[PDB]
Amino acid sequence: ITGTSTVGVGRGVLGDQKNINTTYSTYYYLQDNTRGDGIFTYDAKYRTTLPGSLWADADNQFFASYDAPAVDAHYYAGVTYDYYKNVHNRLSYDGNNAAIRSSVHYSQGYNNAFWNGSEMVYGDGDGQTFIPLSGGIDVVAHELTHAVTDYTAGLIYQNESGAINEAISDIFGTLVEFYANKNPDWEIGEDVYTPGISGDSLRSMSDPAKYGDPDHYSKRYTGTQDNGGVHINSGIINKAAYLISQGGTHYGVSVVGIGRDKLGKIFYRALTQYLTPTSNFSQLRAAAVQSATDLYGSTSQEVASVKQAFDAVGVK
Ligand SMILES: [Ca+2]
Ligand SMILES: [Ca+2]
């Protein structure tokens, strides 16, 4: 759409009010001209055909229940774009300011969200297992990071490489949640998962085993489900990343934490300079060690912590 940039206001899935960047041309559209080539949000009107219609609103006010998921998808993609730009100096997922597109209200009672190779897609949830998935900034940023991976390392979605791909998305989705300072934690999806149950979440990076995911290479899943356990074995890497950041003792191996910022720097460098489509866990360790080395010197504590963390999860 071609029009005048403006700012509207609405309420997101959690009931919080926020301002969003819109475009005016007869209607007010969810089109944000302030970031790269634009952030565009679409209505999939409960169907599976994509992208759907660009979101149009008559009065620039987005307080309807039906508007909530679009408000958050649009807003949270802006935050994610901001994180990448400000923190890592990367312009959009492709590094060249590609437009960011998302569709909401996908299907009916769809309990998932994903990057499809071209855009983001978010279900509304069935209202029991999930509420609309774009209400979770970690979920939005996790999905958008899959686009960053596609343009960079290109990790194939299966087996070890697939679990790497997943862990990267959880790591960065969590880093973005801390960046926005939105009640940050080391859990994934807590804000939109099981509305009736307080205290849980989809996955935990601090303690993957809490939800039955492995926290040591010895416990890795070797079957064929889930594309070879992409959502299971990611817990091993997630746990290593938690330890690099926060520190701790895990299976008797002690790790000194080096903090979130460095965690993000090391990982981004690994992802963008060293990983390849077929990278395995062991190659990830090497990439991470090398990145830390590059960044901080080989006799650095940073390097040391990266080694200790992978040793702790049994990755050689
Ligand atoms: Ca979280
Ligand atoms: Ca819950």
Side-chain angles (χ1 to χ4, degrees):
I1 269 320
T2 285
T4 295
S5 300
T6 187
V7 174
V9 57
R11 216 168 270 293
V13 170
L14 297 192
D16 55 318
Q17 191 163 313
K18 64 201 62 184
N19 295 323
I20 34 175
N21 296 120
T22 54
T23 294
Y24 179 71
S25 192
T26 301
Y27 283 93
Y28 290 97
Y29 294 89
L30 294 189
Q31 169 183 142
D32 178 5
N33 307 115
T34 75
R35 289 169 170 109
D37 293 344
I39 296 170
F40 302 84
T41 303
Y42 292 82
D43 186 8
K45 321 180 151 172
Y46 314 130
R47 294 197 70 93
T48 47
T49 72
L50 292 173
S53 299
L54 182 69
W55 199 287
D57 182 79
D59 55 9
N60 220 15
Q61 289 185 50
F62 301 77
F63 292 105
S65 71
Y66 192 77
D67 297 333
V71 164
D72 283 343
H74 193 69
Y75 184 93
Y76 299 138
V79 177
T80 306
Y81 172 100
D82 295 350
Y83 169 82
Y84 277 109
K85 185 171 167 287
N86 292 338
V87 182
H88 296 294
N89 252 267
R90 186 183 183 72
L91 307 181
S92 199
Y93 57 83
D94 76 329
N96 198 20
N97 273 156
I100 295 171
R101 298 181 206 277
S102 305
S103 296
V104 300
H105 298 299
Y106 175 87
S107 199
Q108 296 178 27
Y110 187 71
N111 289 311
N112 202 3
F114 52 102
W115 164 255
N116 75 350
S118 311
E119 60 166 292
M120 295 284 327
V121 185
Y122 297 93
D124 290 325
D126 57 18
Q128 245 240 320
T129 306
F130 282 99
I131 57 180
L133 283 89
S134 50
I137 186 177
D138 53 3
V139 171
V140 170
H142 165 113
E143 280 319 300
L144 201 58
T145 297
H146 280 310
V148 173
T149 300
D150 277 359
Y151 279 87
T152 59
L155 292 157
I156 93 227
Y157 209 64
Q158 88 174 297
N159 310 323
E160 284 190 15
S161 57
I164 292 157
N165 191 322
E166 270 308 303
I168 297 281
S169 286
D170 282 348
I171 289 157
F172 285 100
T174 283
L175 288 182
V176 174
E177 175 178 320
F178 269 97
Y179 178 76
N181 215 359
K182 235 238 151 202
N183 265 239
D185 42 63
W186 297 87
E187 311 282 283
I188 304 286
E190 59 291 345
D191 294 333
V192 291
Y193 188 57
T194 64
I197 315 181
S198 266
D200 56 346
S201 77
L202 204 49
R203 291 188 279 286
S204 170
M205 305 175 70
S206 60
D207 185 11
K210 185 188 237 192
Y211 303 109
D213 292 322
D215 62 0
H216 196 280
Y217 200 63
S218 76
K219 304 188 175 203
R220 68 192 181 290
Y221 172 77
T222 72
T224 55
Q225 236 59 98
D226 187 28
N227 272 111
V230 311
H231 299 88
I232 297 162
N233 296 326
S234 52
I236 300 167
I237 304 304
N238 285 344
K239 179 83 195 180
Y242 171 75
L243 286 171
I244 291 169
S245 178
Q246 305 297 99
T249 300
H250 180 64
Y251 299 97
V253 175
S254 286
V255 188
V256 188
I258 64 178
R260 274 154 21 228
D261 297 356
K262 310 191 169 166
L263 173 70
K265 282 206 261 165
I266 292 165
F267 274 81
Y268 182 78
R269 180 168 184 87
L271 177 64
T272 55
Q273 315 269 356
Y274 294 116
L275 297 180
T276 69
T278 62
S279 286
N280 63 31
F281 280 12
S282 180
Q283 279 156 320
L284 171 64
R285 175 189 173 118
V289 162
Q290 176 73 242
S291 308
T293 290
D294 289 356
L295 288 171
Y296 301 110
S298 55
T299 56
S300 66
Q301 176 63 252
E302 293 73 11
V303 172
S305 295
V306 174
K307 284 159 150 157
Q308 288 295 301
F310 277 96
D311 280 353
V313 294
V315 173
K316 296 335 203 254

